[PDB]
A paper describes a structure:
ATP synthases are macromolecular machines consisting of an ATP-hydrolysis-driven F1 motor and a proton-translocation-driven FO motor. The F1 and FO motors oppose each other’s action on a shared rotor subcomplex and are held stationary relative to each other by a peripheral stalk. In Saccharomyces cerevisiae, the FO region contains subunits a, e, f, g, i/j, k, 8, part of subunit b, and the c10-ring of the rotor, while the F1 region includes a trimer of catalytic subunit αβ pairs and subunits γ, δ, and ε from the rotor.
To test the hypothesis that the peripheral stalk of ATP synthase deforms under strain, we next added ATP to the preparation and froze cryoEM specimens. Classification of the resulting dataset yielded maps showing six different F1 states, corresponding to the catalytic and binding dwell structures from each of the three main rotational states. Subclassification of these populations separated each catalytic and each binding state into conformations with increasing rotation of the rotor relative to subunit a, and increasingly strained peripheral stalks, designated as ‘a’, ‘b’, ‘c’, etc. Remarkably, the α3β3γδεc10 models from all 18 catalytic dwell conformations could be overlaid with high-fidelity (left), as could the nine α3β3γδεc10 models from binding dwell conformations (right), with some limited flexibility at the interface between F1 and the c-ring.
Numbering used by the authors:
A (entry chain T): 26 to 249
B (entry chain Z): 1 to 48
C (entry chain I): 8 to 23, 27 to 49, 53 to 61
D (entry chain Y): 1 to 37
E (entry chain 6), L (entry chain 3): 2 to 75
F (entry chain V): 117 to 173
G (entry chain H): 11 to 23, 26 to 90, 92 to 97, 99 to 115, 118 to 136
H (entry chain U): 54 to 105
Write the structure that this text describes.
């Protein structure tokens, strides 16, 4: 088993603990900790009902929920100082994006036939640009394929690598003459702030993924 | 490419898709209905 | 507060320096009690 | 609670799963191609 | 070998074109939020118009991206 | 009615009592849960009108 | 041609420049001005007809340049010289009123009036 | 290098225990209370109905 | 050889910069559309033809840049 | 060679310039959100999702520029 | 060698340009905060956390750019 | 030496990063002045927020400057 | 040696570009003052301390840039 595999097991066990014994006694009012994952439940309920509302909304709610929760946990766990970055293996995140994009294309073809490509005929316009708006709509349609993945990957990777570069630099900042030990707090404070910011952009990315691939799924489920 | 050109791409991707299927099933069959149980139990008390 | 109520209160205040006419002061002092009328019926004659 | 409740995720999420299998195979061939680079 | 050096340089320069489209995308979406707050109820009609404008603005950036790839990959 | 009044008085759950026990006293719970899962709707109407929704929208 | 009027009496209902305090800041109207509607806020108003200038203290209202270049100013009551210390004492009392509390709005308006007065 | 990250994480946990953990206590408490109060209210309500 | 072909690649890269202007441009027309339409409501049916014209013209400047890029490629 | 490795490093630097347009873009969307919310008050429930959508796409064009930088530099 | 070492320094510099866009970005968010609070007098309880969110996203592009600057300078 | 030339040239290029902060700060102060001129009395809340915004805008510029010094001195 | 002196004078030119941002900035602060005064002249004295503060702060970023310029040119 690889380093990546070992940390995927660790992520799975973290997620298991968040419901298995986060709810003590299966209390009616429920333990205070489960109130957090209740609020998460409600804001993704109202988001994917907000997006892909309709008869099939709750039929895609487990999928949109594990797309929140995977990215939400994996951009907190990966932010631990000595923990192996699964997400810094871009190939899992980019593959998941392509899979969902292809799984939108297949769903679209299945659900809406060969008139699936009428999704890429947007609306009435004067006739010399009716075909044009199909070409540079389809160009944008498989720009949707990679965009969703490349957002999350770039942000998370750049955060960890930035932090490590500054951390190594402040190490060598504190290995020069003793006057640097005095008032060497300003670069340390920058690293503290960067670590604080990285939790934020990880939760922001975890929500933004699951809404954006609700927007693509909105297009696929309901043509226009 | 600090680990972005291994040959272990398929190793990574295999364990990756295994984790997704596990979490999908796990949420859907176990834990999501345990939240929906809280909602419904609360609503049953509300109705009662 | 109502926009015209806002202007009204301001006008009443604005007659305060002072040199002012009785008619101004009379114009700035109300003399009524609005009788709210329910459906026949009538909630209390609150001083307008 | 932690009772296994049936969810119809085996036919709703069929186009997603078809895409997963295709990428799985394609990455096998891609991994073999990248290991010669 | 000048050609190979240039291939990498040329790719970099191509990247510059994209910035304008990024600004453009924001300009359409700014109008969307502004408009919706201005009318209230315009939103259902306006949202398709907006998506069209987004796609078109985006497409200019896509052209720039393609030229980057054309140099880079060859 | 005397007996029921006494039963609510001598055992009033309003904090705890297992929700599993609420399922045990009412399989109506599981009937609704199963029907909701079968329906593919995870909105519970009535829940929202007397318990708020945490939302960021 | 200015039409400046109060229900109490008309004032000008020819006039070259009128300077008005509006929710759109301050508006000055000079000859042809594009036809507008403006909420007049509690105000100090200056009217100049030729170079002769008459100064009005105005309790807010509405202002409307009409499309026939007729500046309808309507307000509840007014001259600046007529308005022009005891009121400052009253306004102090009005600060006291804010402590307890329509009375809240009233006391707030009294503060607005204190500003309007301070302008004098 | 990485010991700098552990110091920052410790600092982060200090800020959390100062700010977030009581804030989240108050948030959690508020919700917990609201739910509990609804429950006990319905129980009270239902005792009334028996008497009615 | 090496230098001239190299120079072609350089020139092509530079040409993308011209496109950026069109990118901002298309958006400005569309922004106006959303603002205008939210302001009037009803103008939209008359305005939508005008909007298409504006889109096309904005795009056209970009097309000139694009074809120069293609020539160099 | 020296020339080729240099050309990669220089080319990467040029690519990084692209991010600026998206950076300003993202702020414009959030500004519109704050502006809208202050104008309406109550619209926010609808408008916040709309803003999140606008954010994502504006961000993505910059990130495309970033990815070219990464590709040249790392590769 | 000398050319490669030079290319590190130059590459960092070029990357530093991009930061300017994020600087403007932050300012736009705060401008909107000021403007909004000035419009409503009272939007602020909602709008202040909303503004901090806007700040964080606009800032982030600059920081990615800054990372590339450091990668080029330091290696 | 080419390395010596490179640090001087590079120092120049890095200085350009400051430009954005210079525009930025002025927009914050402009908005402060516009806001306060509209409200009058908003200033008590708003002036602290304006200084916060100023600091953050300037902070980005300091990163630019720190890179500039890393080139120039280093 | 000639390379060093060349780089110095070229480099001096490059830094000077940064000043443009401040040049727009100063105008923006003064424009705001003029507009504020015209929209309400009574606020003017409250605004006046903030106005001088804003002018200085806008100019200052340009002076940071200018110190780098002089470090290259004279130093």
């Amino acid at each position: 088993l690889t380093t990546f595999s070992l940390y995927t097991i660790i992520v799975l066990l973290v997620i298991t603990s968040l419901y298995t014994l986060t709810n003590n006694n299966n209390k009616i009012i429920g333990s205070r900790w489960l109130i957090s994952q209740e609020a998460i439940y409600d804001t993704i309920m109202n988001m994917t009902k907000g997006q892909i509302g309709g008869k099939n909304w709750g039929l895609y709610f487990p999928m949109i929920f594990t797309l929140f929760m995977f990215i939400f946990i994996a951009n907190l766990i990966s932010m631990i100082p000595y923990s192996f970055a699964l997400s810094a293996h871009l190939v899992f995140i980019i593959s998941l994006s392509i899979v969902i994009w292809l799984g939108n294309t297949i769903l679209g073809l299945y659900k809406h036939g060969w008139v699936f490509f009428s999704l890429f005929v947007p609306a009435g316009t004067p006739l010399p640009l009716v075909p044009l708006l199909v070409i540079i709509e389809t160009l944008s349609y498989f720009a949707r394929a990679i965009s969703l993945g490349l957002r999350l990957g770039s942000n998370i990777l750049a955060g960890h690598l930035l932090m490590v570069i500054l951390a190594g630099l402040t190490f060598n900042f504190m290995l020069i003459n003793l006057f640097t030990l005095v008032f060497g707090f300003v670069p340390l404070a920058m690293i503290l702030a960067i670590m604080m910011l990285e939790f934020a952009i990880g939760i922001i990315q975890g929500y933004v993924w699951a809404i954006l691939t609700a927007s693509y799924l909105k297009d696929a489920v309901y043509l226009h | 490419m600090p680990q972005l050109v291994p040959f272990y791409f398929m190793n990574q991707l295999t364990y990756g898709f295994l984790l997704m299927i596990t979490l999908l099933i796990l949420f859907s069959q176990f834990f999501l209905p345990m939240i929906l149980r809280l909602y419904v139990s609360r609503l049953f008390i509300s109705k009662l | 507060i109502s926009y015209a109520a806002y202007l009204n209160v301001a006008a009443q205040a604005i007659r305060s320096t002072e040199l002012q006419t009785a008619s101004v002061l009379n114009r700035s002092q109300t003399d009524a009690f609005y009788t709210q009328y329910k459906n026949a019926s009538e909630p209390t004659p609150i001083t307008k | 609670m932690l009772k296994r409740f049936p969810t119809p995720i085996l036919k709703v999420y069929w186009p997603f799963f078809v895409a997963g299998a295709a990428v799985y195979y394609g990455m096998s061939k891609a991994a073999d191609l990248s290991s010669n680079t | 070998q000048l050609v190979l050096a240039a291939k990498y340089i040329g790719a970099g320069i191509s990247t510059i074109g994209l910035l304008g489209a990024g600004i453009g995308i924001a300009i359409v979406f700014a109008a969307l939020i502004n408009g919706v707050s201005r009318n209230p109820s315009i939103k259902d009609t306006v949202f398709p118009m907006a998506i069209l404008g987004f796609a078109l603005s985006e497409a200019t950036g896509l052209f720039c991206l393609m030229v980057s790839f054309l140099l880079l990959f060859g | 009615l005397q007996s029921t009044l006494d039963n609510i008085q001598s055992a009033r759950p309003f904090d705890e009592l297992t929700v599993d026990d609420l399922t045990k006293i009412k399989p109506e719970i599981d009937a609704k849960v199963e029907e909701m899962v079968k329906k593919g709707k995870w909105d519970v109407p009535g829940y929202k009108d007397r318990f708020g929704n945490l939302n960021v929208m | 041609k200015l039409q400046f009027a109060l229900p109490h009496e008309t004032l000008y209902s020819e006039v070259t420049q009128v300077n008005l305090p509006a929710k759109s800041g301050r508006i000055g109207v000079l000859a042809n001005h594009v036809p507008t509607v403006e909420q007049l806020l509690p105000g100090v108003v200056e009217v100049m007809e030729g170079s002769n200038s008459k100064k009005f203290f105005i309790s807010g209202g509405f202002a409307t340049v009409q499309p026939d270049s007729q500046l309808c100013v309507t307000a509840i009551e007014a001259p600046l010289e007529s308005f022009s210390e005891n009121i400052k004492n009253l306004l102090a009392e009005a600060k006291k009123n804010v402590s307890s509390s329509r009375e809240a709005a009233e006391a707030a308006i009294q503060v607005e009036v204190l500003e309007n007065l301070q302008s004098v | 290098d990485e010991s700098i990250l552990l110091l920052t994480f410790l600092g982060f946990t200090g800020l959390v225990a100062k700010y977030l953990a009581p804030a989240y206590k108050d948030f959690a408490d508020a919700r917990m209370k609201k739910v509990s109060d609804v429950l006990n209210a319905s129980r009270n309500k239902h005792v009334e109905a028996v008497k009615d």
